Design a protein around this nucleic acid. Structure first.
Ligand SMILES: [Mg+2]
Length: 753
DNA sequence: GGGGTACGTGATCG
DNA sequence: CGATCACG
């Protein structure tokens, strides 16, 4: 079978050619389409206006741009028939050149579908879905180790090891002598990079797995390949990996392949305070992994002693990256297929953007004109548009999930922006408290799609019970899971300020109808002896005060079984889990500990390089005292001792360092924060300050804002300089612990002597 | 060989 | 305050 893995376009004689990358019975095939044309829609005041509108012109690449053909089309907008004009263009890059010239026009009411990338336009319009079929893909995990010294410019240090892994095993390429069976010793950094290029071209993997290869491995490989005057022909068309700007960070694509970066995937899928490969591997496979820190790698490389340890670490990084990629790719592949967009894009998207891509495709299928994304003004206005947890430390906490309730509410009440407050509506549903009216006269666009999604999931689930084949059961399990994830993202999407089908009234109405079921669950739990400690639209936490843990579990499992049997249709409550202890601060700010001693928090931990070690160490100690020791008095004593130690200059300066990256040329800064004031002084000294550089600084005692009192760590002398104890107490240590301790009745002022 | 693509949050500046 | 900036 022919499986689409990606799509893009190339220009030939100034004209666009769509490229469809396929895997057909184990073979890479590239299909070319020259006939598909770019277009936008324009809603005109009157049909007569088209004569003036079709004559609109623009300029691109020195040459003028024209509307190639115009077509009157009948579509649906806001659940109403609408007549719009399809404005065809020669090249997709013509659209950003001419769209505002068309929008400007006095006879143009509005323009639509003017920001849809050409390759995604093609996939939607041609009814093409990526990752369909039983086609078996090949995978290769790739990792690199670099020589790093404190605060160096990105790419100054050479790549010292390159590792890769597949089903054949994990291997290391290095340019220093190491006697291990899996180590390939080459002569230079140049020859090691060329060997990675050779491995990739020979193995010809369909998927390249990395752990943060978007921001580290590939940008570094590209930087070192540039310095060394060598190419990286990793694309199946011999093109080099392409760095793309996604937000403030990067995204790397390899043409004809899927660069599958696990880092954005795992960050979305699982909840951890740190996303180190070691923490992630232990969380998924329950196995320990050793870390070899940058300073240890530098010492081993420079001394030539203890290099076997470094090569074992590099080899394991690839081996576990391969194991994790194989664990997480099947789900990303089913989400790709379900939304009808490539894995590359889907693996790097929020669920809100997954819903939008599903909706855009379904809009084309149903002849529905898509609403536009908001302008800066509308986006801000949406962000402006508008139960309390139990205090103390609780034991034996049961977690219940409400999320599978909302798709059913959207369908039954026909909650959709196209059904909201319709004029001359015969029958409508009124939302409780909020009072929004949703027309019953026709099924809304979103309710209609959701119903089909939920029906399709029930069919898959029925096929799973009636299947004797463990292979299709595995594939169908990922399919029903992908639908559940997509369906449960619709509620959130109605409220997403960047959404096309954004509807505040829809989100409130679903919250209002949802609340009746939440109040039922809360009441039925409370009559069973349960105390509800935390409730949000997503779920709740409860316990039976002073009851045995097995009894809390048994009663909770019995309770979900009971409620689901009382709730009509596909309305479903889910038992998420059990926790030995936990405390709750506010909405989505809480911390729990499971029976295996794993701490799980939401909106509290500060495990980041721009927070000093003293603040992170104290916060970890406070959480451990509370969750592992069940002792809030110990936690308060920890803070009081640390702050006194800071007052008396008893804390080592290494625990006071703040790290912040330089992201621009120094002259481009508008606000000069401490790291920039320090960076400007270094540049003045002759230091090559470049974006990517990470500035380590300590805040000293004195007058003025912190920026004037910050010193570079390399300039800090414990004899001459005195750190600002008030800054480390009030701006570092106390903010790190004050939110946690507020759950127990302490204010900032109670945490000192 | 393309193209808009990321958020949610919290500190510090101006 | 809003604006700016950075983390993962
Ligand atoms: Mg590594």
């Amino acid at each position: 079978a022919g499986m689409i893995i990606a799509a893009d376009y190339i220009t030939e004689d100034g004209k666009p050619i769509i490229r469809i990358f396929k895997k057909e019975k184990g073979e890479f095939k590239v299909e070319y389409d020259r006939t598909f044309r770019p277009y936008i829609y324009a809603l005109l005041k009157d049909d007569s206006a088209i004569d003036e509108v079709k004559k609109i012109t623009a300029e691109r690449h020195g040459k003028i741009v024209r509307i190639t053909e115009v077509e009157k089309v009948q579509k649906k907008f806001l659940g109403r028939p609408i007549e719009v004009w399809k404005l065809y263009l020669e090249h997709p890059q013509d659209v950003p050149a001419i769209r505002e010239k068309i929008r400007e026009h006095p006879a143009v009411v509005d323009i639509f579908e003017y920001d849809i990338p050409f390759a995604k336009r093609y996939l939607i319009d041609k009814g093409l879905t990526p990752m369909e079929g039983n086609e078996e893909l090949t995978f290769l995990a790739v990792d690199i180790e670099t020589l790093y010294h404190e605060g160096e410019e990105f790419g100054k240090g050479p790549i010292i090891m390159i590792s890769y892994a597949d089903e054949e095993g994990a291997k290391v390429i290095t340019w220093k002598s190491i006697d291990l069976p899996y180590v390939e010793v080459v002569s230079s950094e140049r020859e090691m990079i060329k060997r990675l290029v050779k491995v990739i071209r020979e193995k010809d993997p369909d998927v390249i797995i990395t752990y943060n290869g978007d921001n580290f491995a590939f940008p570094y490989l590209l930087k070192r390949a540039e310095k060394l005057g060598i190419k990286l022909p990793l694309g199946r068309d011999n093109s080099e990996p392409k760095m793309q700007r996604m937000g403030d960070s990067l995204a790397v694509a390899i043409k004809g392949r899927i660069h599958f970066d696990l880092f954005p995937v795992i960050r979305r899928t699982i909840n951890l305070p740190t996303y180190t490969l070691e923490a992630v591997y232990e969380a998924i496979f329950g196995k320990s992994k050793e870390k070899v820190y940058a300073h240890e790698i530098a010492e081993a490389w420079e001394t030539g002693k203890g290099l076997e340890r470094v090569a074992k670490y590099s080899m394991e990084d690839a081996k576990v990256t391969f194991e994790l990629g194989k664990e997480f790719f099947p789900m990303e592949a089913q989400l790709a297929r379900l939304v009808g967009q490539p894995v590359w894009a889907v693996s790097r998207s929020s669920t809100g953007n997954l819903v939008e891509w599903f909706l855009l495709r379904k809009a084309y299928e149903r002849n529905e004109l898509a609403p536009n994304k908001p302008d800066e003004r509308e986006y801000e206005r949406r962000l402006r548009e508008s139960k309390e947890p139990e205090k103390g430390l609780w034991e034996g906490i049961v977690s219940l999930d409400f999320r599978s309730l909302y798709p059913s509410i959207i369908i039954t009440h026909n909650v959709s922006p196209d059904t909201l407050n319709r004029e001359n509506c015969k029958e409508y549903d009124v939302a409780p408290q909020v009072g929004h009216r949703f027309c019953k006269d026709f099924p809304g666009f979103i309710p209609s799609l959701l119903g089909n999604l939920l029906e399709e999931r029930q069919k898959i689930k029925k096929r799973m019970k009636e299947s004797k084949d463990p292979v299709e059961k595995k594939l169908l399990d990922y399919r029903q899971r992908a639908i559940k994830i997509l369906a449960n993202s619709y509620y959130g999407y109605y409220g997403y300020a960047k959404a096309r089908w954004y509807c505040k009234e829809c989100a409130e109405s679903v919250t209002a109808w949802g609340r009746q079921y939440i109040d039922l669950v809360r009441r039925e739990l409370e009559s069973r002896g349960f105390k509800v400690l935390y409730i949000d639209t997503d779920g709740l936490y409860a316990t039976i005060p002073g009851a045995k843990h097995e009894e809390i579990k048994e009663k909770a499992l019995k309770f979900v079984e009971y409620i689901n049997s009382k709730l009509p249709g596909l309305l479903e409550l889910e038992y998420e889990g059990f926790y030995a202890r936990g405390f709750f601060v506010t909405k989505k700010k809480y911390a729990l500990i499971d029976e295996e001693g794993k701490i799980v928090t939401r909106g509290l931990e500060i495990v980041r390089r721009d927070w000093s070690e003293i603040a992170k160490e104290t916060q970890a100690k406070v959480l451990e005292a509370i969750l592992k020791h069940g002792n809030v008095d110990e936690a308060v004593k920890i803070v009081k001792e640390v702050t006194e130690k800071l007052s008396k200059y008893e804390i080592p300066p290494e625990k006071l360092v703040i790290y912040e990256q330089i992201t621009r040329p120094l002259s481009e800064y508008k606000a000069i924060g401490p790291h920039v004031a320090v960076a400007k002084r270094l540049a003045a000294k002759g230091v090559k300050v470049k974006p990517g550089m990470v500035i380590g600084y300590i805040v000293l005692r004195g007058d003025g804002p912190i920026s004037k009192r910050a010193i570079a760590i390399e300039e800090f002398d414990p004899k001459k300089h005195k750190y600002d104890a008030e800054y480390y107490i009030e701006n570092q240590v106390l903010p790190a612990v004050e939110r946690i301790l507020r759950a127990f009745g302490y204010r900032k002022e109670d945490l000192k002597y």
